[PDB]
């Protein structure tokens, strides 16, 4: 993926798309809930998540 063409932007767009799907999946039923608990299932940092969300 180092020699990958400009389509990498579209790849990141698909990644952010699935990310949006998950975010509107698990968060939606929860009005107010722990962020670490809901991020425990995705086992990823809350930094980029908070960034994309706030964006």
């Amino acid at each position: 993926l180092r020699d990958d063409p400009i389509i990498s932007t579209h790849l990141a767009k698909l990644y952010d798309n699935l990310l949006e799907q998950n975010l509107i999946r698990v968060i939606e039923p929860f009005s107010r809930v722990q962020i670490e608990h809901i991020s425990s299932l995705i086992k990823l940092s809350k930094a980029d998540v908070e960034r994309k969300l706030s964006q």
Binding site: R25, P29, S31, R32, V33, Q34
Partner: peptide
């Protein structure tokens, strides 16, 4: 199971 059981309307607490 509730999320596909349509639990979408509710109020929870942190």
């Amino acid at each position: 199971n509730l999320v596909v059981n349509k639990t979408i309307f509710a109020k929870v607490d942190r």
